[PDB]
Amino acid sequence: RGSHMTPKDDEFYQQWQLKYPKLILREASSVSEELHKEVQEAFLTLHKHGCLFRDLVRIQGKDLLTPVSRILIGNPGCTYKYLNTRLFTVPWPVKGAEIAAACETFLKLNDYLQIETIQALEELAADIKSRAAYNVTLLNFMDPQKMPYLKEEPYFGMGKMAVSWHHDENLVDRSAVAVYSYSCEGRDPDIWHVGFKISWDIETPGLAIPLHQGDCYFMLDDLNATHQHCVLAGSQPRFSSTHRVAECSTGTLDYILQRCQLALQNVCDDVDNDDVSLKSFEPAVLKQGEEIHNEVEFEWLRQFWFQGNRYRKCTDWWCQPMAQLEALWKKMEGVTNAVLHEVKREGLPVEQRNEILTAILASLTARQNLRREWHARCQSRIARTLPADQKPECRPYWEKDDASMPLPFDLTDIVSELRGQLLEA
Ligand SMILES: CCN(CC)C(=O)/C(C#N)=C/c1cc(O)c(O)c([N+](=O)[O-])c1
């Protein structure tokens, strides 16, 4: 049988040094009581207002609600995608009433953990400042009494898991992760731990680090890639603040707005009307436009409104931007329509038409498939169990009658029509 080690074991500390040197633990008594209280006030402020929600993630085909409920706080405009679900940052006051105060506290905590990480990363050596530049945190909460449906840890006999074994995805390469853990009020089943294992390995015994009132641990350098980790549930309620360097190259509002603007360079923009005229019918420009169409629709709009309107409760930072992206997306439906008018006109040579079809066909087929996948995910079993606060909306969705939208939602006819023309002898 597989086994684990805790601080109570004698081999525990030689194993920390030898096989987990990139894991660092700072006890509660190293962090100031000024900051402890401020952070513990911010937890409750966000919990009372109902900012934390259980995510409806997709994982190996299945639709699952996470045991832990959570909120993402971070730089304004930044997003963090995990388990096929994009979380949107309730913003913090970065350079340049009660909910905004709580978010400022977590920025203060974030700067404190950044200092301790740069310190530890310098000590590791004897690119550092970028790989400790935490741009977001992911606050998590769970009450084991009110949420007593927890899986048993399979490999080492650690017991109930609030979160099972995994890597933190979508992080900057070799970036650190700092975690503040706060409870209320073999391994002790009543106390919250964090589990650690080497990847692919259940022979080498795992590590269970106990966490109490404000204990902080740090995943450094390649640890998160080389090792997996889980959270082990205790009996009392427990908050955590997990600070990450999110790889947000393509996951910011500034980025998606710029992409939208690049797609609309192909349309005559004197006036905003339904008569959308395109400047070029070159394969590359059209290919690019429909790729951008899919990017704004599926990575931003449907991701937002799938969780929506849960964000409106604790902030309204995203309200104006998401309306702006919907307007931009609505224009791009006109572009697709204008492309379909071009391929379906009497004056085009068959060769020109087929170059245009080859350019857009993969983008349109992907659009159909993802629309079905999203429409199915909105109307699943567990999706129709959430309250009216978090009702999985399927926006954008419009009916076959709806004459404001130029093209239909269901693209099956449009798609197979275009495939037919490409196979013509
Ligand atoms: C102890 C507090 N923590 C540690 C930081 C967490 O709550 C946590 C982590 N990590 C949650 C988490 C984050 C993810 O990005 C992710 O993909 C998954 N997952 O695969 O289910 C879980």
Tokens of 387: 């309250």
Listed resolution, Å: 2.8
Which of 267, 269, 330 lies closest to 296 in space, CA to CA?
330
* H or E stretch covering 226: helix 223-226
Which of 73, 77, 74, 72 lies closest to 257 in space, CA to CA?
77
User: How far, in Å, from the CA of 163 to the mean position of ligand 1?
Assistant: 7
Which of 367, 398, 406 lies closest to 289 in space, CA to CA?
367
Q: What does the DSSP assignment read for 19-61?
A: H-TTEEEE-GGGS-HHHHHHHHHHHHHHHHTT--EEEEEEETT
323 three-state secondary structure: helix
28 lines ligand 1 (CB under 6 A): no
Residue nearest ligand 1's atom 2 by CA: 240
397 Cβ partners below 8 Å, 6+ apart?
Answer: 375, 409
User: How far, in Å, from the CA of 66 to the mean position of ligand 1?
Assistant: 10
Supply φ then ψ for residue 343, to 5 degrees.
-65, -25
List, in order of start, the domains of the chain with CATH numbers. 1-252 (2.60.120.590), 253-386 (1.20.58.1470)
DSSP state for residue 86 in the 8-state scheme = E
Residue nearest ligand 1's atom 19 by CA: 166
Way it was determined? X-ray
Which of 167, 194, 163 lies closest to 181 in space, CA to CA?
194
Using the structure block, give the residue that is written with the tokens 């998590």. Answer: 140
137 lines ligand 1 (CB under 6 A): no
Q: Is 50 left (phi over 0), alpha (psi -120 to 50) or beta?
A: left
Which of 418, 417, 413 lies closest to 354 in space, CA to CA?
418
Nearest-atom number in ligand 1 for the CA of 194 is 1
Tokens of 167: 């890597």
245 lines ligand 1 (CB under 6 A): no
User: How far, in Å, from the CA of 138 to the mean position of ligand 1?
Assistant: 8
Q: Output the CA torsion sign for 189, 206, 231, 23.
A: positive
CA pair distance 258, 264, nearest whole angstrom:
10
Q: CA 158, 44, 308 angle in degrees (round to 5)?
A: 85
User: How far, in Å, from the CA of 272 to the mean position of ligand 1?
Assistant: 44
The answer to whether 286 touches 340, Cβ cutoff 8 Å, is no
CA pair distance 158, 154, nearest whole angstrom:
8
User: Which amino acid is residue 58, in one-letter code?
Assistant: R
Q: Which burial class, exposed, middle or buried, applies to 200 when counting CB atoms under 10 A from its CB (0-12, 13-18, 19+)? A: exposed
Residue nearest ligand 1's atom 1 by CA: 231
260 three-state secondary structure: helix
User: How far, in Å, from the CA of 135 to the mean position of ligand 1?
Assistant: 16
347 Cβ partners below 8 Å, 6+ apart?
Answer: none
Length of the chain: 425
Residue nearest ligand 1's atom 18 by CA: 168
Q: Which of 80, 141, 166 to mutate to test the pocket of ligand 1 (most atoms within 8 A of CB)?
A: 166
169 lines ligand 1 (CB under 6 A): yes
Which of 181, 85, 96, 89 lies closest to 135 in space, CA to CA?
89
308 Cβ partners below 8 Å, 6+ apart?
Answer: 393, 395
The answer to whether 289 touches 335, Cβ cutoff 8 Å, is yes
User: How far, in Å, from the CA of 242 to the mean position of ligand 1?
Assistant: 8
84 Cβ partners below 8 Å, 6+ apart?
Answer: 57, 58, 59
143 Cβ partners below 8 Å, 6+ apart?
Answer: 237
82 lines ligand 1 (CB under 6 A): yes
CA pair distance 278, 359, nearest whole angstrom:
16
User: How far, in Å, from the CA of 230 to the mean position of ligand 1?
Assistant: 8
CA pair distance 277, 269, nearest whole angstrom:
9
Nearest-atom number in ligand 1 for the CA of 162 is 7
Q: CA 260, 267, 324 angle in degrees (round to 5)?
A: 35
Q: How far apart are the first and last CA of the chain?
A: 65
Residue nearest ligand 1's atom 9 by CA: 168
- The binding site for substrate comprises 70, 82, 166-169
342-345 LR contacts (CB < 8 Å, sep 24+): 342/278, 342/281, 343/418, 343/421
- For the chain, how are helix, strand and coil distributed in percent, rounded to 5? 40, 25, 35
Tokens of 225: 């890639």
